[PDB]
Structure formats: structure tokens, C-alpha cells
Amino acid sequence: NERLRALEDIEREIGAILQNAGTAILELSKEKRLLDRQAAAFTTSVQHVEAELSAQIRYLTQVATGQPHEGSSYSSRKDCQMALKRVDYARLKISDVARTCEQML
Amino acid sequence: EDGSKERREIVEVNKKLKQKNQQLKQIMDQLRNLIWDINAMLAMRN
């Protein structure tokens, strides 16, 4: 789940506070603290976000010709459900036998 | 056999035992049939 967590982090950081902090210093026309931090987050953060996006884009790219990157694709998980059904029917039959026994005694 | 020349309680107990065997076999039948339960299903049983 490494790639999933990376994509989630990239999505959470896409709408970062940089896009909202570009309208903070312009309102501060009465006092000039660490206001310089409102300058370094103008384009460097966007540049890093774009670099990370391009890096994530340049992944393995499994899909080339047909339908690769499988992984469920397969066996008796179905028959495992059927085995659970067997368990349920055995439960039903045992309950019926117990009811028959109770009726007989 | 030949030479060419009280049982109320007994019958009651006999009828009681016969009914007991009847209900016993009735209780048997179910588990008797469902006894195998894996025989037809050995193809995937372990």
C-alpha cells in the first residue's frame, strides 16, 4: 500500500496552504515577524509539487498492450464461500436433528 | 407342541418399549442419513 499512501499524500498536499497564503501579506499594510516565509512558498512549493507529480507519473506503467497487472483473477475463493455454505447447511441439519430428538424425547 | 391327543403389565411394557424403539429409530434416521456429509464431497475435502 506504499503507492496508495503516496497518492493519498500527494492528493492531500495538492491543495496545500501555499495557494491560500498568497493573499496574506498583501493584507498586512500596517506592520512588517517572519513575513518573508510568505515569499519562499510562492513558486518553490508549486515547483516541488509539479516535480513530485511528474515523478509519480513516471511509474512502471504496467498497461502496455493488453490487460496486465492482474492479481485476483483466480481460484476457489468461490469454493471457499461454498464451503461456508456447507457449514451453514450442516448447522441447519444439526438444528433439525436436535429438534427431532427433542420431539422424540 | 402336542402329542396327537396377569400379562397386562407385560403387554403394557412391551407396547411402551415398542413405541420407544419407534421414536428411537425416528431420531436415528436424520443423523443416519446426514452421517456421511463428506462422502460425496471428498473431491475437495482436504
Side-chain angles (χ1 to χ4, degrees), chain A residues 6 15-16 21-22 24 39-41 51 55 59 64 66 68 70-71 74-75 77-78 81-83 86 89-91 93 98, chain B residues 2-5 14 18 21 23-24 28 32-33 36 40-41 43:
Chain A
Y59 273 171
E70 289 179 323
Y74 209 58
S75 61
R77 165 206 161 93
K78 171 188 67 177
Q81 186 175 2
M82 315 186 65
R86 311 169 204 165
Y89 184 82
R91 172 60 50 76
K93 266 272 161 61
Chain B
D2 200 48
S4 315
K5 44 201 171 193
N14 175 42
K18 193 183 175 298
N21 184 27
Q23 54 87 29
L24 174 46
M28 285 167 51
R32 179 73 166 86
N33 196 359
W36 306 351
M41 277 204 205

